[PDB]
A = this chain, B = another copy of it.
């Protein structure tokens, strides 16, 4: 019973968080095996951030200029390299708490948990989604850079995000663990506007199935629709177009509830056209799009 915006347990990621200082800039690093991963803008001064030439700035840096502290103890840096927008600091010690892990580049609409950190220490954990405009609506302050986004399959942590920057609109941008930014963002202090933040339709449908499973059924109607009819409505409301791939992934939810995907699409269509009329669905007065079909299945089935 009940449905919550739930994050993965953060313990396995907490054991990886370290503090990286270069010059007077301190941010978070991710220590897996004998490598510490951190945003390359750690080498920048606020002056450098306007038009940084990271290759040129990195030439002035040596292994001893990167101060890596894991808890209250210092790690010895025996190598450094830049891979896209991340720095990989080879340390002389393998992280004893390194969990089984993968580096994955997620697609827009996918969700993950963020372990927000400051000075290498965790402050909190929350669930995010990679928006269709490749930004994330997180909660990050100065010093939070290097905090990571991740998913967990039983004992394997799939790192998908590393926080790099706050856009002038208060939304967030970052890279995968190979240093490649999601979206067109660049690590520089230049105004970069985000594109249209469309609603993740397949996620809203999954959350509507979760509402049905949990007893919120007032929005179920006597209608059906087609993928083409639904998508005409979705385009009008800045929702992502629904494909047969989305319908397929909603299959287990449709089977669990006995509500055909296109019937749920018609309920969503009426909710978009008529609004909630002061009502709520799973304690929300708006259509939630940050639960994937997999998240709804996982939460509703108790996967650990």
Contact = CB atoms under 8 A, between A and B. Distances in A.
A302 B138 CA distance: 13
A126 B5 contact: yes
A119 B304 contact: yes
A184 interface: no
Interface string A1-42: 111111111111011000000000000000000000000000
Interface in A81-122: 115-119, 121-122
A224 interface: no
- Give the number of copies in the complex: 2
Interface stretch (A48-56, A166-174, A248-256): A166-174
A133 interface: no
B124 A6 contact: yes
Interface of A: 1-12, 14-15, 115-119, 121-126, 137-141, 143-144, 166, 170-172, 214-215, 275-276, 278, 280, 283-286, 298-304
Give the top 8 A-B pairs by smallest Cβ distance, nearest first. Answer: A11-B11, A285-B285, A121-B304, A6-B124, A9-B122, A4-B139, A1-B170, A285-B286
